[PDB]
Amino acid sequence: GGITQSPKYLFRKEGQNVTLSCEQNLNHDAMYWYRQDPGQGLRLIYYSQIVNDFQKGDIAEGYSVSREKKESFPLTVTSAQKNPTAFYLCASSIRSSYEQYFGPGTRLTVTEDLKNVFPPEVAVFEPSEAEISHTQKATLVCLATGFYPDHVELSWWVNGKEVHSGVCTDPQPLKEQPALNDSRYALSSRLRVSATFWQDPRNHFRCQVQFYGLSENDEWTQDRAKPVTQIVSAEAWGRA
Amino acid sequence: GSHSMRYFFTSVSRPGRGEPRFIAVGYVDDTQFVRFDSDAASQRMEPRAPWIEQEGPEYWDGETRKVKAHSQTHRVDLGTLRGYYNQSEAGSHTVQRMYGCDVGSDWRFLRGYHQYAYDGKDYIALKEDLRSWTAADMAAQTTKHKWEAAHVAEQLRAYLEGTCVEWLRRYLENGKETLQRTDAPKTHMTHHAVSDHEATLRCWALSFYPAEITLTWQRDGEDQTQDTELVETRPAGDGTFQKWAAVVVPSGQEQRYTCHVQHEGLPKPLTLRWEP
Amino acid sequence: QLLEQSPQFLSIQEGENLTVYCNSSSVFSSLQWYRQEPGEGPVLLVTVVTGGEVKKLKRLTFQFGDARKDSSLHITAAQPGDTGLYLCAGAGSQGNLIFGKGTKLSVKPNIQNPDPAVYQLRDSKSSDKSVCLFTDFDSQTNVSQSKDSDVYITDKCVLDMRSMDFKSNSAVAWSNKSDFACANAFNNSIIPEDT
Amino acid sequence: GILEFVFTL
Amino acid sequence: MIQRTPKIQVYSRHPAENGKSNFLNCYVSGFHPSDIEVDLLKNGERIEKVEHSDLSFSKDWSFYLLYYTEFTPTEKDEYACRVNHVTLSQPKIVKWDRDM
């Protein structure tokens, strides 16, 4: 058994309510809700020691929950929350005050208007020839640009198969214009391989970026393509 | 002297889809001071004794909050215990629970309690060391293991050895004219004629607190236990308690018998004799 | 009921041994240790109960105070994988867990032979579109951030080529500006002249 | 004062 | 499943004075299960205004309850307490003795 949160990424307009779901099959009576800001700690919102009973936490304002079923513990983010945008975590213990098992977590981002939503632009940068001669090994670089919100998943693909070795990615993206509240973001990643393999034109490299944006429910009356949940990619072959 | 605080919880399931009955009462020594009833309209922790009415909203709103959780967690236990014993949903079953602490004359911790019962019989109970559990049957053995795994004993011991005696000490000092008081027994003995040869001497003990008392009938020898009749200590309804002991005596030999009364309010035991 | 952890941030070299503390004026029946990576759910490491308890998980070593008021997390032979937030949690009286603010541990790798070099990469698709790859630098040096509104500078990133035991540090900067140069990037930061 | 934490059977 | 028959005691709060007012007590105890039914009787008919304590129990998990009402004793009035329980086939009545 385990504890689950759905979805992983969550995006809403300002002032519209949203409900987060934490469900378990660990046979736990206690369930908890924490919100976590970037570079911060956990803050308890609501928690239920037992079904049909719950209680406020340290920062319970703007939230409401229900514990009608032992298995689930829905968190409702009311429009009255001053700063809804955070990283939400659900946890559970076999009984109150004992060791808790956390869910994967859910990222919620609330924007002022849906117009600020943009899909990322992905570009693969081929290894500098100065590098191969110097370090005898090559480096590939991907770069996502101008995406809002901050909901992206980057991966590297070699010959149709995903690689994790020789791969690194920024833990935190960058605000292109920190002055704006709903600023767009940029992310970078790396894939380093031997000079031998990038010299080989039989090997295919692909930097893949999964973006989570809008839904069919939301209406997009604009002159640019609807920024729905999509996959942006860029590829490159071997050279010499 | 020695004091104690006790909480008694009674959870009774109702046949069919009738909501379970929950009753929670609190006792300091022999004095009840709080109550909670699921069939009540207030749905709050209510004061029974006037000395606990000193507490503001924070206390009562807090105690209300915690006892609601006690009701729900016991509604679950009713269903769980039904499954353990393969019982039908048609029958009505009862779950009982008690926990509390005991203090010395200097109000230092002495004893802690935490027990469970199902349908009138012991289920699981915390041993005196506050480390172990006593599970009567294989059904309770499941609970014992679950509580051993979640380390319920340790966290309970903190409450019993700590928070409990902290609460009791607060209650004792808030209303000391009521809890610390000791009302001495107002004793007298009455004589009655049974047929003619035998006669009944009844030693009365009235209006005393605490409820603990000892009434024995002794002759020129000593303590004639058996033949003597003893009744269960009963409440008068005014906070005090009542109890009497009687023994049937042959006519004329009424002067030979005497009644011993021992109570906390009595500095020395009382020796009472019948004189025509 | 409060749980305090020291130090807040710890950044030591790979292979060494460390110790993280969690102190409290309150007594705890049970205490838990968690390890959280950024953006993911905290992973339960251990639960200590008895006073003076010593338990080991892989290279991690947990210690419970005799009075059950303190706890310590000892890592042996620290690896860059140990990088993350280490949280101290204790049994709260109100049916919850009391959390510490955690210790952010950064286990920096011991690069064998520093090769500090700045390269320039061009887009596979077209031009200009060029970025600078500041890489193979030592752990101690720190890449400061941007100041030019166009210029965007990422933070250092450690990748591990597990093929035959090799790790490296790297950094990335870019701009659309015509006057953006590799020699005039990262100059806002202190970097070795052994380029 | 009653317990501040509850636990099922 | 175990059952216990209630022990019944009918008495007065204060010693009986035929002129003075007093309280009539019916003390059922040691009974199980919890569901019990207690009435106070004056001359065979139900005294309507009767109150009781809150459901508690002793060490042996058996409950005790005290039913009480205000009354003024007289020479020829007969007071009693009728209690019914699942352990009782018929409603059990205990006549009050002012000296017991």
Side-chain angles (χ1 to χ4, degrees):
Chain A
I3 172 174
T4 63
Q5 295 189 224
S6 300
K8 181 186 174 187
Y9 297 104
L10 204 47
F11 183 74
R12 294 295 175 270
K13 191 190 179 60
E14 192 178 45
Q16 60 181 201
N17 293 338
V18 63
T19 313
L20 288 78
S21 62
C22 183
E23 305 186 10
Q24 73 184 5
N25 51 12
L26 298 162
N27 295 321
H28 289 180
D29 299 285
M31 298 192 66
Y32 304 81
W33 272 110
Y34 308 94
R35 61 162 289 168
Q36 182 180 1
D37 292 338
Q40 288 278 353
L42 303 173
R43 289 203 292 171
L44 184 54
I45 305 178
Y46 262 99
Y47 68 101
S48 175
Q49 302 195 53
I50 191 52
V51 63
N52 298 322
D53 189 274
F54 48 84
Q55 40 186 140
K56 284 178 166 59
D58 316 330
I59 186 70
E61 293 227 313
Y63 296 92
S64 61
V65 295
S66 70
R67 189 73 184 282
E68 303 172 359
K69 302 297 179 60
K70 174 184 179 181
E71 292 74 30
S72 65
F73 190 46
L75 172 67
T76 311
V77 183
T78 326
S79 58
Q81 175 65 19
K82 296 158 184 172
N83 297 319
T85 302
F87 180 65
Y88 295 92
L89 281 162
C90 190
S92 67
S93 58
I94 194 66
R95 71 170 193 88
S96 53
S97 301
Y98 199 56
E99 61 183 12
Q100 298 181 15
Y101 294 82
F102 288 81
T106 292
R107 292 202 54 183
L108 173 64
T109 301
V110 169
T111 194
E112 306 170 355
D113 186 24
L114 291 81
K115 188 165 182 170
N116 306 323
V117 183
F118 282 86
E121 299 203 23
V122 173
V124 167
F125 290 75
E126 294 176 319
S128 180
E129 188 57 34
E131 174 164 17
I132 291 92
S133 175
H134 207 329
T135 65
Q136 292 88 22
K137 293 194 175 187
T139 45
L140 285 154
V141 169
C142 177
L143 218 172
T145 300
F147 54 92
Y148 185 87
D150 205 344
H151 308 162
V152 286
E153 290 180 331
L154 202 158
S155 62
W156 283 91
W157 292 82
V158 170
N159 297 337
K161 288 174 261 296
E162 186 178 5
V163 289
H164 312 275
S165 177
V167 182
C168 202
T169 313
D170 297 25
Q172 57 172 265
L174 282 71
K175 284 191 176 184
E176 296 186 334
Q177 287 301 290
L180 202 69
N181 189 21
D182 301 338
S183 176
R184 302 167 67 170
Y185 291 85
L187 189 83
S188 67
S189 180
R190 303 155 182 87
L191 172 57
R192 181 163 195 153
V193 285
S194 64
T196 300
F197 278 176
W198 188 66
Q199 278 170 357
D200 198 333
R202 300 177 64 157
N203 298 323
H204 184 223
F205 310 102
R206 181 169 64 92
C207 174
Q208 176 174 322
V209 176
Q210 174 80 58
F211 173 75
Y212 301 85
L214 290 179
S215 171
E216 56 172 292
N217 182 266
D218 289 332
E219 175 55 88
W220 181 256
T221 67
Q222 284 282 266
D223 292 275
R224 62 179 174 97
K226 186 173 186 178
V228 299
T229 291
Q230 67 193 250
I231 299 183
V232 195
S233 300
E235 56 180 353
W237 275 92
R239 299 171 61 89
Chain B
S2 300
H3 295 138
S4 64
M5 179 181 62
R6 301 297 177 83
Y7 277 106
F8 304 93
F9 311 91
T10 305
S11 185
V12 179
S13 61
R14 288 301 155 187
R17 291 184 61 258
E19 275 294 309
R21 181 178 183 87
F22 185 70
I23 297 174
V25 289
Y27 279 68
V28 166
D29 287 275
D30 289 331
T31 302
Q32 176 182 156
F33 60 102
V34 286
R35 79 162 177 180
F36 178 80
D37 185 85
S38 63
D39 296 21
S42 66
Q43 292 299 287
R44 293 184 57 92
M45 200 74 171
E46 298 175 340
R48 299 303 301 184
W51 58 263
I52 201 52
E53 298 179 350
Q54 304 172 352
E55 302 295 331
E58 276 84 7
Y59 171 87
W60 294 112
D61 283 275
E63 292 292 312
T64 303
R65 187 172 303 103
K66 294 179 296 179
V67 73
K68 292 259 202 61
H70 278 74
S71 65
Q72 301 288 349
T73 194
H74 284 177
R75 175 199 290 189
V76 176
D77 296 343
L78 273 172
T80 300
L81 290 182
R82 177 198 306 145
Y84 286 170
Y85 294 95
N86 273 265
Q87 300 164 333
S88 175
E89 304 189 30
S92 174
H93 301 267
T94 301
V95 175
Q96 298 163 263
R97 178 188 181 185
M98 179 203 69
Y99 59 75
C101 61
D102 286 12
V103 298
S105 303
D106 64 332
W107 298 7
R108 261 178 54 255
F109 177 81
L110 285 189
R111 192 111 184 272
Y113 295 87
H114 194 259
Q115 297 175 316
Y116 273 86
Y118 190 51
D119 292 330
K121 169 183 156 49
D122 288 347
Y123 184 72
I124 189 179
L126 188 64
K127 262 181 167 57
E128 187 181 356
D129 52 36
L130 308 187
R131 292 179 172 268
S132 307
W133 300 96
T134 302
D137 58 338
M138 266 147 42
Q141 206 70 19
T142 299
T143 296
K144 183 191 180 189
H145 293 166
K146 176 181 178 177
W147 285 6
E148 282 171 350
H151 298 87
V152 186
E154 291 84 335
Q155 196 170 0
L156 272 179
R157 181 174 182 176
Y159 170 82
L160 297 182
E161 291 185 351
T163 313
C164 182
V165 307
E166 287 191 24
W167 276 120
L168 177 56
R169 277 200 277 256
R170 181 181 180 177
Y171 296 153
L172 286 172
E173 69 175 13
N174 287 145
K176 64 176 58 182
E177 66 182 65
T178 313
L179 301 183
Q180 295 180 3
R181 73 177 171 83
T182 85
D183 288 22
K186 301 177 182 178
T187 62
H188 72 80
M189 61 173 304
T190 61
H191 170 253
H192 293 290
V194 178
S195 67
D196 73 273
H197 294 89
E198 288 186 339
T200 296
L201 308 170
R202 180 171 291 103
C203 191
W204 288 77
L206 306 182
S207 301
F208 61 89
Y209 178 86
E212 164 68 3
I213 203 177
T214 299
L215 303 189
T216 57
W217 274 103
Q218 338 83 66
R219 208 164 38 182
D220 57 334
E222 60 254 338
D223 297 319
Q224 189 181 1
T225 306
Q226 100 191 347
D227 311 337
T228 178
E229 185 177 353
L230 189 68
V231 299
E232 186 166 323
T233 307
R234 67 204 191 191
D238 49 17
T240 60
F241 294 87
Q242 304 175 354
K243 183 178 189 144
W244 60 260
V247 59
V248 181
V249 305
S251 61
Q253 299 301 322
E254 315 167 24
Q255 304 195 89
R256 189 183 176 179
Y257 294 76
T258 179
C259 180
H260 262 43
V261 180
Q262 291 77 0
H263 191 261
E264 191 191 62
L266 298 178
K268 303 196 65 177
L270 300 191
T271 308
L272 274 60
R273 194 256 304 186
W274 172 254
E275 170 58 49
Chain C
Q1 232 175 343
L2 305 172
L3 281 176
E4 296 287 325
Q5 294 188 246
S6 185
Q8 294 195 20
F9 315 96
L10 184 66
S11 181
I12 68 173
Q13 294 296 328
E14 177 187 13
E16 295 198 11
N17 308 335
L18 58 96
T19 300
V20 169
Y21 309 93
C22 183
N23 304 89
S24 179
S25 170
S26 308
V27 188
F28 285 90
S29 56
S30 68
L31 191 143
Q32 290 79 215
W33 276 101
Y34 290 91
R35 176 191 181 273
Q36 182 188 17
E37 298 183 7
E40 298 212 330
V43 181
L44 180 61
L45 298 174
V46 84
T47 298
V48 291
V49 180
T50 61
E53 178 162 17
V54 172
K55 199 175 305 175
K56 289 192 307 173
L57 180 64
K58 295 296 181 297
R59 305 186 309 274
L60 267 52
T61 301
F62 308 96
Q63 158 92 9
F64 204 15
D66 298 271
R68 304 169 309 191
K69 308 177 63 172
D70 304 278
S71 180
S72 74
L73 186 150
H74 174 79
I75 297 184
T76 314
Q79 295 187 346
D82 303 329
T83 305
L85 187 61
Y86 288 80
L87 292 158
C88 193
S93 53
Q94 300 83 4
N96 53 9
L97 276 191
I98 315 300
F99 279 99
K101 295 183 177 179
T103 291
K104 188 178 180 181
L105 171 64
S106 299
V107 191
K108 319 214 288 186
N110 288 335
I111 55 168
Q112 191 58 241
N113 306 115
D115 231 332
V118 178
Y119 306 136
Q120 183 174 359
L121 285 70
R122 262 133 193 272
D123 196 350
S124 176
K125 220 174 185 180
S126 181
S127 290
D128 187 30
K129 299 284 188 298
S130 62
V131 302
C132 309
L133 185 56
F134 178 69
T135 177
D136 295 337
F137 55 94
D138 65 317
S139 304
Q140 292 77 8
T141 195
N142 288 90
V143 185
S144 300
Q145 292 300 140
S146 170
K147 181 53 203 302
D148 199 340
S149 300
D150 192 351
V151 173
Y152 297 132
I153 306 178
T154 74
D155 192 28
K156 49 196 298 181
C157 285
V158 176
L159 56 93
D160 177 28
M161 302 180 60
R162 302 196 60 185
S163 300
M164 286 193 61
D165 194 32
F166 184 85
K167 304 183 184 62
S168 59
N169 285 80
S170 319
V172 174
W174 63 83
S175 292
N176 65 84
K177 265 185 177 65
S178 306
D179 63 333
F180 178 79
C182 305
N184 220 83
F186 307 106
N187 283 351
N188 208 127
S189 55
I190 299 93
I191 63 112
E193 201 207 4
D194 198 20
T195 301
Chain D
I2 51 186
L3 276 170
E4 221 148 67
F5 65 99
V6 297
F7 44 90
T8 51
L9 211 45
Chain E
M1 182 64 179
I2 60 105
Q3 295 180 344
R4 303 184 198 260
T5 299
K7 302 181 219 153
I8 322 177
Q9 285 200 53
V10 196
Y11 58 99
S12 54
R13 178 181 297 180
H14 309 296
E17 307 250 19
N18 285 341
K20 189 54 183 58
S21 61
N22 204 7
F23 290 86
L24 177 62
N25 295 337
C26 183
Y27 183 69
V28 290
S29 64
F31 59 95
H32 206 278
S34 167
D35 301 277
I36 208 178
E37 188 167 14
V38 175
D39 263 337
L40 287 178
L41 297 171
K42 172 162 84 171
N43 292 315
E45 229 63 40
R46 297 177 59 253
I47 315 173
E48 262 203 353
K49 208 66 200 70
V50 175
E51 285 148 5
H52 56 287
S53 70
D54 305 328
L55 182 67
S56 180
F57 53 87
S58 294
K59 183 217 169 187
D60 51 26
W61 308 108
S62 60
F63 308 95
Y64 58 86
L65 274 169
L66 175 61
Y67 287 75
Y68 61 93
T69 194
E70 201 172 15
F71 83 118
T72 303
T74 39
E75 278 206 25
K76 295 189 298 181
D77 280 340
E78 291 181 344
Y79 293 92
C81 177
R82 180 180 54 221
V83 181
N84 191 18
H85 193 241
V86 75
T87 64
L88 297 183
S89 307
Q90 321 287 321
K92 185 173 175 179
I93 308 185
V94 180
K95 309 176 69 174
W96 174 52
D97 197 316
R98 70 176 67 228
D99 209 321
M100 172 159 45

